[PDB]
Design a protein around this nucleic acid. Structure first.
Length: 122
RNA sequence: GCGAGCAAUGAUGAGUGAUGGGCGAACUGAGCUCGAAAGAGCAAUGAUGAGUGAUGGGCGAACUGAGCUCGC
């Protein structure tokens, strides 16, 4: 049993999003020090920039956009899933930096359950 | 105060602006959804709001063309 050891972000979202969130926070310490309501908009790029400089439309999502329930679903669900996903990611990044202990099937079950709740709602 | 020089065969005005890429001034911060309705489930370990692309109606918008200069 002491051979099956792994990081959580690789299981909850996988490398295409995990290594992007690390690179857009500059590092994994910095991603673990970030709030859900900034992890939502990491890699929104030109959309975050002009929401500041010109006071434009707030970015609904950043590099999280290609998640398994955002770029492929109705607009009603796209906004609600983005911040819930960023919540569960803000937990997962703090786990993988500060302790490195594995819980990611429960972090998956909670994000199945909150998206099933978004389904009974919408 | 009055005259003098230049000018439609071109007097006047302006040291200031363009195009492209990030960051900073404490994102919202609790509601939502189902139900005859009390109620029930989800939620600060993040509810909700803030998307991109396209379709239709409405609203508004800015070079001049003669003045410039002076001696006592």
């Amino acid at each position: 049993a002491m051979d099956d050891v792994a990081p959580n972000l690789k299981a909850l979202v996988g490398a295409k999003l995990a290594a992007r969130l690390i690179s857009l926070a500059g590092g994994l310490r910095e991603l673990a020090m970030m709030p859900s309501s900034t992890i939502q908009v990491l890699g929104a790029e030109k959309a975050l920039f002009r929401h500041l400089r010109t006071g434009a439309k707030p970015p609904k999502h950043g590099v999280i956009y290609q998640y398994p329930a955002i770029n492929r679903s109705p607009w009603w669900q796209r906004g609600k899933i983005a911040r819930a996903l960023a919540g569960k990611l803000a937990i997962a990044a703090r786990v993988d930096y500060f302790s490195g202990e594995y819980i990611a099937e429960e972090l998956k079950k909670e994000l199945e359950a909150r998206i099933r709740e978004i389904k009974e709602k919408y």
